[PDB]
Structure 1
Amino acid sequence: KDLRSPICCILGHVDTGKTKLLDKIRQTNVQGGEAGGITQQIGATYFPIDAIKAKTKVMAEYEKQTFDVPGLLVIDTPSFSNLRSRGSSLCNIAILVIDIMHGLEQQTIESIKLLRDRKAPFVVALNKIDRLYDWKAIPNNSFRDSFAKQSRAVQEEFQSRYSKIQLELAEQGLNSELYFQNKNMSKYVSIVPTSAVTGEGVPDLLWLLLELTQKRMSKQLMYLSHVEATILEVKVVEGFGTTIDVILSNGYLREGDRIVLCGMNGPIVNIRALLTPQPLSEYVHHKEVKAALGVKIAANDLEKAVSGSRLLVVGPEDDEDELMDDVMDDLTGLLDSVDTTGKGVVVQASTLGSLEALLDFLKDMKIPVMSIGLGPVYKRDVMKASTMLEKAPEYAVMLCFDVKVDKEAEQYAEQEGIKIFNADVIYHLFDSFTAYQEKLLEERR
């Protein structure tokens, strides 16, 4: 069957060894040789199927192998992969990282709810097994071979910490099991013990990713001419100006293509350049690109482009206005969910998905929202909170999620009485906000 590469993503609490794990997955160096052809793309790293074979050679004695996909695509940055609205998904399968030395943490809890609300398929990487006392490492080994060669005390400690984490997941409404002991691969979460330091378990992880996607999600991997593209990030590049970084999940892109996307001031409508990184910052130019890959698009008027936006191509038969109204549905739908004349807090987020997640939580959690925005916070944005200084300074604050605040903007906010909360984590914004609300409640007199 004509399949394209599965797309996977990685997430989990901070300091769980996510980036380190990613680096281990990407290194050329494996047990007995090297994995060749591993290429850097825009926002993602690409693994041709031969590189996966090399990486999973040690897994062949423990499982049957399947190599029907052309390769594997991994998003390079650990929410950023959940940037579109809840309605769709570019990431085929997620990797939830759990620190075995700390178990379930609060940002793991958030991740799980996020994955659940999207019905995103995922596995967990039970990371940092090398931190178990007296663990003897065999670099880039399969988990089961290494585990069998451990002392008993080490195996006992693993079982103890693993069974506890297993109970924590069940408290979150998740049945989980070691991947090779899982009797229900679609309902029960598969656990893969890994080490970002040694590479142990990484072959298992890659084998599992290929297994779940090819055996249980082959329909999603079927290549189609229909264009599926989601804006990953908006970046200014010197000899191009403002560019957009997209993940092309299916279809073709051709330079010269007329494209429609969601913008902050309304819809945006031609591709000048299709760019990929040069490995020997400089880019390669392509007349056309085929899914699946991460690619950078150069075009005019991309300055106001929205992260999370779908990307549509205007064909011979399409009406541009209909296509423009289509992509704007996701952003516009968020606008009409807040009370603007009624008055509450200001909110700004990085993407459509993170904005939606924050808004739904805030409504769920009684906190009135007055205004919303996307991307980097400027003074213009914080001034929207000025209307809240006198009538109820309690709501004269900004809730910022995963966005940068300009020095210029944080200076101004403090000239006034505008408190700025900025976090990577929703419960952090909430905790900060309530504490501020409570600090005003013994401004008793």
Structure 2
Amino acid sequence: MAKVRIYQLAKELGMETQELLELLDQMGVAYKSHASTLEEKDAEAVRELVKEQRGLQEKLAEEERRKSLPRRPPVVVIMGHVDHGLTTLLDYLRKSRIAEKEAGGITQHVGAFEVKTPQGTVVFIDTPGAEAKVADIAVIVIAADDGIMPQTEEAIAHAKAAGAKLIFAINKIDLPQADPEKVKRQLMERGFVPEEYGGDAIVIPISAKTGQGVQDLLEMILLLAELEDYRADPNAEPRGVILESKLDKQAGIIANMLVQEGTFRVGDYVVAGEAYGRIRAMMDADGNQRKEAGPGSAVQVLGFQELPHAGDVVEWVPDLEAAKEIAEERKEERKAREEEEKARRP
């Protein structure tokens, strides 16, 4: 401190000579060389300025990082004619992760399940949809033998309405009457031109029965997820969607929720449409109790006081009172629109 030479102060602060000499020029402190002695008040000023500038750097670098949100996994729904092997595909995907279980032990149905690959994790909504936005991607399954049917065209229209990206999966490619070329013509008739022919429709041959092609579907999902670059903020206000709800004799009202933003925690108050409660417990697809559920997580939630509806947005609220006010304001507004039916003009 009193008195320090510039090369000594540099060592102490971990700076290179020329950096400290630059700083002193910025401060207007004259010196002959790095061997010169500094007045105590100059050295002190240097120490303060360097501390601050380093504070500031760090603040800045933190900000740059914090504003880059982590990846969230792609959410996928499987759709198409119920006879075209949807459940066989879902089942196949559910098994490629119980290889030869732990185990075990243990599994729960919580509305969605995860498929892990070296390239990343995919979230599949459980039970195909006939049927808020839930899925990023809809896989439209079409049997090679049967071709595009009315259920197929409804699945396509619902997926498009919901804003999902389509992947066409032509299944049963090993039946003797399998005709994928016919399916592709049917697709092109409908404005879906396969990439093969220079169009934008993604078309993938699979067999849900043997699993042939299934790894290519997963790779394609993950590639699209990399390009769309799906991300979410785990510290935003928690937001989810109800996938389904039911009564348990033993447990009471249960609901499956998929988390989209923020992180829900046990003890949080939530409102979903007109239903509300305090999260008493959350259980994931492995049957584990979780204290927290962040983006992409599907969990069974205990604590709702009435059955929430499928597709309703789950919102964090600060307290019980807020939860009751929000749910109630929605209830009396619904009655209002309904009362705009009983009166005039039925």
TM-score (norm 1): 0.54
Counterpart of 1:225 (choices 235, 240, 245) is: 235
2:137 paired with 1:129:
no
Partner in structure 1 of residue 219 of structure 2 = 207
CA 1:235 to 1:319, structure 2 compared with 1: closer, same or farther past 3 Å? closer
CA 1:339 to 1:164, structure 2 compared with 1: closer, same or farther past 3 Å? farther
How do residues 77-226 of structure 1 correspond to structure 2 at under 5 angstroms? Answer: 77-79=127-129, 84=132, 89-132=133-176, 161-177=179-195, 181=196, 183=198, 188-215=200-227, 217-218=228-229, 220-226=230-236
Conservation of the 8 A alpha-carbon contact between 1:7 and 1:72: yes
Partner in structure 2 of residue 290 of structure 1 = 294
Conservation of the 8 A alpha-carbon contact between 2:78 and 2:129: no
Q: State the alpha-carbon separation in 1 of the partners of residues 102 and 296 from structure 2.
A: 19
Identity among equivalent pairs (%)? 27
Counterpart of 1:262 (choices 252, 273, 283) is: 273
Q: State the alpha-carbon separation in 2 of the partners of residues 238 and 3 from structure 1.
A: 38
Q: State the shift of 1:122 in Å.
A: 1.5
Aligned residue type for 2:149: E
Partner in structure 2 of residue 382 of structure 1 = none
Q: State the alpha-carbon separation in 1 of the partners of residues 341 and 111 from structure 2.
A: 36
Q: State the shift of 1:324 in Å.
A: 4.2
Aligned residue type for 2:261: N
Q: State the shift of 1:341 in Å.
A: 5.1
Partner in structure 2 of residue 2 of structure 1 = 70
Q: State the alpha-carbon separation in 1 of the partners of residues 174 and 276 from structure 2.
A: 50
Name the SS of the counterpart of 1:272 in structure 2. strand
How do residues 22-101 of structure 1 correspond to structure 2 at under 5 angstroms? Answer: 22-28=90-96, 42-48=110-116, 52-53=117-118, 67=119, 69=120, 71-79=121-129, 84=132, 89-101=133-145
Q: State the shift of 1:328 in Å.
A: 7.1
Q: State the shift of 1:326 in Å.
A: 9.0
Counterpart of 2:257 (choices 232, 240, 246) is: 246
Aligned residue type for 1:197: K
Aligned residue type for 2:86: K
Q: State the alpha-carbon separation in 1 of the partners of residues 224 and 110 from structure 2.
A: 25
Q: State the alpha-carbon separation in 2 of the partners of residues 337 and 121 from structure 1.
A: 39
Q: State the alpha-carbon separation in 2 of the partners of residues 182 and 321 from structure 1.
A: 56
Q: State the alpha-carbon separation in 1 of the partners of residues 233 and 109 from structure 2.
A: 19
CA 1:257 to 1:29, structure 2 compared with 1: closer, same or farther past 3 Å? closer
Q: State the alpha-carbon separation in 1 of the partners of residues 340 and 180 from structure 2.
A: 43
Q: State the alpha-carbon separation in 1 of the partners of residues 146 and 167 from structure 2.
A: 18
Q: State the alpha-carbon separation in 2 of the partners of residues 253 and 275 from structure 1.
A: 12
2:312 paired with 1:309:
yes
Larger deviation, residues 164-173 vs 21-30: 21-30
CA 1:128 to 1:36, structure 2 compared with 1: closer, same or farther past 3 Å? farther
Conservation of the 8 A alpha-carbon contact between 2:246 and 2:253: yes
Extract structure 1 runs of 4+ deviating beyond 4 A: 33-41, 318-329, 331-343
Conservation of the 8 A alpha-carbon contact between 1:244 and 1:302: no
Aligned residue type for 2:75: I
Aligned residue type for 2:293: V
Larger radius of gyration between Structure 1 and Structure 2: 2
Aligned residue type for 2:317: V
TM-score (norm 2): 0.68
Partner in structure 2 of residue 16 of structure 1 = 84
* Uncovered stretches (5+) of structure 1, i.e. residues with no partner: 54-66, 134-157, 344-369, 371-445
Aligned residue type for 1:73: V
Q: State the alpha-carbon separation in 2 of the partners of residues 327 and 189 from structure 1.
A: 41
How do residues 394-409 of structure 1 correspond to structure 2 at under 5 angstroms? Answer: none
Conservation of the 8 A alpha-carbon contact between 2:111 and 2:298: yes
Q: State the alpha-carbon separation in 2 of the partners of residues 200 and 275 from structure 1.
A: 33
Conservation of the 8 A alpha-carbon contact between 1:245 and 1:294: yes
Number of aligned residue pairs: give it: 274
Q: State the shift of 1:315 in Å.
A: 3.4
CA RMSD of aligned residues (A): 3.5
Q: State the alpha-carbon separation in 2 of the partners of residues 173 and 197 from structure 1.
A: 29
How do residues 405-416 of structure 1 correspond to structure 2 at under 5 angstroms? Answer: none
Q: State the shift of 1:252 in Å.
A: 0.7
Conservation of the 8 A alpha-carbon contact between 1:261 and 1:327: no
